[PDB]
Amino acid sequence: ATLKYICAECSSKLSLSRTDAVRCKDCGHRILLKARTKRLVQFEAR
């Protein structure tokens, strides 16, 4: 959710330290995305 990133398969939210671990907690799976901010953004529809 609000926190930093997500698994690939687990879709399990997780946060991480630096030079820490590539694995998530629950997944024996590696790759992970980065969650979208709470920061406001803008488009214009036209």
Partner: protein
């Protein structure tokens, strides 16, 4: 001439307005008025909520063309345009999503707004009576009730198909008090804005400015408005019988009409036909019938986007042009 247009199998005839005392020995049809007025007429087809249709007579193509044009472009209509968002995770490309809401019509009037100024920057741009700002959020929830496998994923998942209905609006100071009996509504509430599944959420507040059609269709008051030229048919000789019965069979059901085996084929009514000019292929029906239309007499109709009553739309587009002239009259002329 004589408001007749040639309809011939490969071609047309007598198109340009050609009435004014430029082009004739005797110089007539020179302007004035009140020959215009008392000759000029108009009629209505029917009046509906989101649609209008009617008929016009005894004017050239031009000014009518104007009404169509300014009607599809230079008339006002207001819509949500600028888009602000409360995150999103969903599948749909968030831009394209914005484009959606950008386009969806609204039922709201002008005249309760003003125009944005390119000047007066920052927050001063979008202000109060000049802006209508919309917010929406849904975080899809799995419906814990699981009747079947693969229902519509509604029984699976609450509020999966998001609608203009799902939009609401936040009124503000002086913004509330005015629309109390004019509840802000998104025209047709039923449109698919997005599809989704729980573990997904979308939230936004976009902004709503007044706009003009020529810049973007999303500012059209109208789905489409056009004038079909009123059809006419001249017929010759009795030519009655099954052959004549074949004749009307050459046209859509409105066509002509048949009183009897005798009394040949009489026009039932015009304006039902598509002006689809088939008869000239069968080559027998030719010499008794010519096809054409009257440049004075305009079938003219319009779709309301749901914006407002099109009768008043059309009425507006007229005045908008009247203005456009007037502003030009007493505007001075530099050399």
């Amino acid at each position: 001439m004589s408001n007749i247009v040639g309809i011939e199998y490969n071609r047309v005839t007598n198109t340009t307005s050609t009435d004014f005392p430029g082009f004739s020995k005797d110089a007539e049809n020179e302007w004035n008025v009140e020959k215009f007025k008392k000759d000029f007429e108009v009629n209505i087809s029917s009046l509906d909520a989101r649609e209008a249709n009617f008929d016009l007579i005894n004017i050239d193509t031009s000014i009518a063309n104007a009404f169509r044009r300014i009607m599809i472009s230079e008339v006002p209509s207001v819509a949500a345009e600028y888009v602000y968002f409360f995150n999103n995770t969903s599948v749909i490309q968030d831009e394209v999503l914005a484009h959606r809401i950008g386009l969806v019509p609204l039922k709201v009037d002008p005249d309760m707004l003003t125009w944005v100024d390119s000047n007066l920057p920052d927050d001063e741009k979008f202000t109060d009576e000049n802006t209508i700002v919309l917010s929406l959020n849904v975080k899809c929830t799995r419906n814990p009730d699981a009747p079947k496998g693969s229902t519509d994923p509604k029984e699976l998942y609450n509020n999966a198909h998001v609608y203009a209905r799902d939009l609401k609006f936040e009124p503000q100071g002086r913004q509330s008090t005015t629309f109390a009996d004019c509840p802000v509504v998104p025209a047709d509430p039923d449109i698919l804005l997005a599809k989704l599944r729980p573990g997904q959420e979308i939230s936004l507040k976009a902004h709503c400015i007044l706009g003009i059609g020529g810049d973007h269709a999303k500012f059209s008051p109208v789905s489409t408005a056009s004038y079909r030229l009123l059809p006419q048919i001249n017929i010759l000789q009795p030519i009655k019988g099954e052959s004549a019965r074949r004749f009307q069979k050459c046209f859509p059901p409105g066509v002509i009409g048949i009183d009897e085996g005798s009394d040949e084929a009489y026009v039932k009514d015009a304006r039902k036909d598509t002006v689809s000019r088939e008869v000239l292929r069968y080559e027998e029906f030719a010499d008794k019938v010519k096809l054409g239309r009257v440049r004075n007499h305009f079938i003219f109709n319009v779709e309301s986007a749901g914006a407002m009553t099109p009768e008043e739309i059309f009425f507006k587009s007229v005045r908008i042009l009247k203005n456009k002239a007037e502003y030009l009259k007493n505007c001075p002329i530099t050399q």
